[PDB]
Amino acid sequence: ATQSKPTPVKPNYALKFTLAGHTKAVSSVKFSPNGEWLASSSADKLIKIWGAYDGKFEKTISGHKLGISDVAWSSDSNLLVSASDDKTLKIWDVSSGKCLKTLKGHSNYVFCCNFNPQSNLIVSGSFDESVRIWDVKTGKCLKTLPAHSDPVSAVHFNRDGSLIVSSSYDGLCRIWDTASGQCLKTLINPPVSFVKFSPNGKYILAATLDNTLKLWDYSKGKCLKTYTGHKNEKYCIFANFSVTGGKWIVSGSEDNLVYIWNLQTKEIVQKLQGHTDVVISTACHPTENIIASAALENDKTIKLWKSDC
Ligand SMILES: COc1cc(CN2CCc3c(cc(C[n+]4ccn(C)c4N)cc3-c3ccc(F)cc3C)C2=O)cc(OC)c1
Numbered sequence: 001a002t003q004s005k006p007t008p009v010k011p012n013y014a015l016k017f018t019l020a021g022h023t024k025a026v027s028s029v030k031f032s033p034n035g036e037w038l039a040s041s042s043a044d045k046l047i048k049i050w051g052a053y054d055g056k057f058e059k060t061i062s063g064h065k066l067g068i069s070d071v072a073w074s075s076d077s078n079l080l081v082s083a084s085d086d087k088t089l090k091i092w093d094v095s096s097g098k099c100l101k102t103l104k105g106h107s108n109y110v111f112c113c114n115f116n117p118q119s120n121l122i123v124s125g126s127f128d129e130s131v132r133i134w135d136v137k138t139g140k141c142l143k144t145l146p147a148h149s150d151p152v153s154a155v156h157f158n159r160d161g162s163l164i165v166s167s168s169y170d171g172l173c174r175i176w177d178t179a180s181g182q183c184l185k186t187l188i189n190p191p192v193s194f195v196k197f198s199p200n201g202k203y204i205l206a207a208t209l210d211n212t213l214k215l216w217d218y219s220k221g222k223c224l225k226t227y228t229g230h231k232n233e234k235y236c237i238f239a240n241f242s243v244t245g246g247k248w249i250v251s252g253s254e255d256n257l258v259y260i261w262n263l264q265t266k267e268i269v270q271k272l273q274g275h276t277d278v279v280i281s282t283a284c285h286p287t288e289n290i291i292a293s294a295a296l297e298n299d300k301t302i303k304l305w306k307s308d309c
Pocket residue numbers: 025026027028042043044066067068069070085111112113151152153154155169193194234235236237238280281296
């Protein structure tokens with residue numbers, strides 16, 4: 001008798017549910033931190049809440065005047081924030097489905113948003129090329145960062161909220177000190193279409209519109225891993241670290257597939273087939289081996305896939 005380390009070579013994600021309901025392109029899907037829910041945003045101006053395990057439709061949340069690009073959960077899974085083409089963000093109580101606050105200040109489309117781990121702040125990126133930091137409790141804009149010289153494609157807090165990472169079509173990835181709003185680091189140039197901090201908080205996963213994902217050690221400023229084989233030259237596609245089982249990288253792709261790479265070897269380990277348009281968003285369940293994927297207007301569905309590892 002001994003204790004062994006399971007080292008799976010590939011996952012075996014298989015389609016379990018397809019979720020219909022949105023009437024235009026789906027823009028973003030996100031699992032709630034408590035693992036109970038999936039939230040989706042769409043160009044149809046709606047947010048929809050679904051059961052994370054069975055995909056059962058739970059509710060529709062409305063009030064935005066134009067399409068919604070992004071949604072994000074608070075740490076206690078009780079709030080959502082949404083970024084809209086109506087130039088506002090909205091903070092919602094998920095239980096009631098009612099808008100708590102409207103965050104106004106951006107002068108163009110709001111493309112991306114996130115809570116910080118404490119969930120007392122919200123960070124947003126916009127087509128107006130700025131990154132804004134908002135107080136959740138008052139709804140007031142605390143700071144406006146002249147972050148980029150093109151639309152901001154992603155914003156993400158690190159694990160204690162002390163840092164913000166942003167990316168833009170201007171070709172830059174920047175790291176900002178949350179407290180001061182000042183730039184701590186710039187990495188520079190094809191458009192950077194997505195960025196996010198790793199689960200361990202030490203790395204940055206960055207996508208560029210040359211069909212490339214890169215894992216960077218941001219402090220050393222060194223690229224540690226690169227993942228290719230998918231198609232990404234036009235859209236800002238969400239990517240993820242999958243850490244509940246084997247250590248994978250997950251992304252959508254413009255060839256309508258979900259790509260899964262071995263994080264360490266960078267080999268493609270799985271390709272998920274089923275969507276009929278660009279897989280613009282993917283998300284990984286916080287505790288179970290479950291992936292949600294969502295596609296653009298020729299498809300308009302969300303799919304839930306499950307793996308044994
Ligand atoms: C030439 O100029 C440009 C061109 C584009 C191209 N584009 C615009 C439309 C879009 C895109 C990506 C995502 C996915 N999405 C949401 C948040 N996040 C962090 C990521 N990744 C959603 C949506 C979107 C937005 C609102 C809706 F109502 C419906 C949809 C489908 C995307 O790729 C971006 C751009 O700046 C960012 C400048």
